[PDB]
Symmetry: C2
Subunit: 288 residues, 2 copies
Amino acid sequence: EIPARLRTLHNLVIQYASQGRYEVAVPLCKQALEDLEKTSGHDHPDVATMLNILALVYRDQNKYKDAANLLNDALAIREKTLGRDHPAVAATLNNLAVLYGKRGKYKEAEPLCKRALEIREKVLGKDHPDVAKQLNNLALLCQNQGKYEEVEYYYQRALGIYQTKLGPDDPNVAKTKNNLASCYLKQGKFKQAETLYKEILTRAHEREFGSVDDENKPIWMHAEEREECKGGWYKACKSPTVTTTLKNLGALYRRQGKFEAAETLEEAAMRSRVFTTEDIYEWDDSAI
Amino acid sequence: PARLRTLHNLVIQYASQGRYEVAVPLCKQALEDLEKTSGHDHPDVATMLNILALVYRDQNKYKDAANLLNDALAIREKTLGRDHPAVAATLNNLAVLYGKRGKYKEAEPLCKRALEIREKVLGKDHPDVAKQLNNLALLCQNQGKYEEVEYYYQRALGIYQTKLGPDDPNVAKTKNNLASCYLKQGKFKQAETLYKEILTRAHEREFGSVDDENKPIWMHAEEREECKGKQKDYGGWYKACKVDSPTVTTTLKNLGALYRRQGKFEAAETLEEAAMRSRTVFTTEDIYEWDDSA
C-alpha cells in the first residue's frame, strides 16, 4: 500500500502547488521523494519528475541555487533512464541554463543551452518553432557574454523560423524582435533597434486598422509629426511586449532630444496596462 | 508656458515607468500652475486630473482617484456635452472606482448612464456595449441581483458571438465571468458546462478538430478518472505563450476544483497539472474593464 500513499501524495503536491500554497507543497514534495527512494531507488524517472516539481516551486520563491541543485540531480537521472536526446532532458537542460543565467553564470549556462538546442533540432527538425524559442535563450546567454556576432545570427535564425512557420502577427515575432532590439541597444546600434520597434508598432496598427495611409497612421508617425510642429474599447484585448516597445522607442526619442515624440509614446504606454531592458528567459514547462 | 510643457513631459515620463513617488508631486504642481495660467473647467485641466487619477488607481487610492474623476466629469459634461464618448469613459471609470471600494449602490447608476450613452452612439448590439454590460453585471453580482447578472452576461455573450468570432478573447472572458456568477449561486453544473465550452474551443483553435486521438484536457481527465484501475504506471513549446492565457488558467483551476468537489481527484490532478505548466476554494476575482480612451 506504499504506492497508494504515493498516488495521494502526488495528488496533494499538485493540488497545493497549483494554488501557490508552497508552505504545504514543499514538505509533501520532500515526503514523496523520501517514500519514492525507499520503493524505486534514486535513479527512477518519477524521482526526477518530483525533483522538477520542487525546482519549479523553488524558482517561484527565487531560490535559484536550490532549484539548480535539484535539476542537476534530475538531469543525471533522466540521462541514465530516458537517454540523452530525450525531450525531457532538453527541458531540464534549458531550465538549468536559465537558472545559471539568472545568477549571471553565463559560461556554465551556454553549453547546457547548446546541448538542448542539438536535442530539439534532432527530434523536431532545424526549422521547428521550439528550436526558435531555444535560440532566443541561447542568444540572451551569449548577449551577456558580449558575443554580439553569434547573438545577431541566432535571433535572425529564430525570427526566420517564426515568420515562415507562424504568422508575421504571432506574439513570438514581436517578443523576438524586442530581444534583438535590446541586443542592438547594448551595442549602441540605436537606429537598428528603432527600426525593429517601428516594425512591431506598424504591424500591430495594420492588424487593427488595415493599411497605412495619410488618414490612418501608427502612433510613432503621429509622434514624429508632433515633434516637427512644437468605439474600439473591445479591441483593447488584442500585449505587455507592445508596452515595452512603446517605452523603449519613447526612450530612443528622448535620447535624440525629441521630447514631444517621447511624450506621445509614453502616454500610449500608460494607457496600455533608462531603457526597459530585462533579460526574459523562456522556461520549458514540459519537464512536468 | 515652457514650464508647463516640461512639467507635463516629466509627469508622463515618470508615470510610464511606474515611478509614482515622482509623478504625483509634479502632477499636483502642473495642476496648481495650470489653474493660474488657463481657466479651471478647461479640457486640459480634466486631462491632467485623469492622469493623476490613473496614478492613484494603480496605488489603490480609489477614494482620491474618484474625487479627481468627479471633478474631471463635471468639466467634460460642461465642455463636450452629456452624451460625448469621453463622458462615457469617465462614468465607467468612476463606476469601477466606486466598485473597487464596495460602494455598489453608488456605482450602478454611473455604469448604467455610460451604457445608455454607448447604446445611443454605437447601437444596442455593438461590442463596446457588451464590454460595458460585463462591468454592470459585476456591480449587480456584488449586490446579489443574480437574475439581472445572468441577463446582462447572456446579452453581452450574444453581442460578442454574433459580431466578433466565437474564437474572440472577449467570449472566453465573458463565459468565465458568467461561470463565476454560477459558482456564487451554487449552480456548479452550469459553471462546469461553460468551463468545458471554453477548453473545447481553445483546444480546437490550437490543435484542430476533436477526435479519439486528439481530445481536450477535460476529456483526458474524465478518461483518467474512469480508468483508475485500467491506468498502467511532441513539442508545442511555442504554443504555450499564446495558449497560456490567464482566463484559460482560471478555467483549468476552477474546473479542477469542481472535479475535486465531485470526488474525481484524478480528473482534478490532470487539470491542476496543466494549470501549473500554464503559469471548496475557487479563483473568483472581480475583473473590471477600464476605459483607457478617457
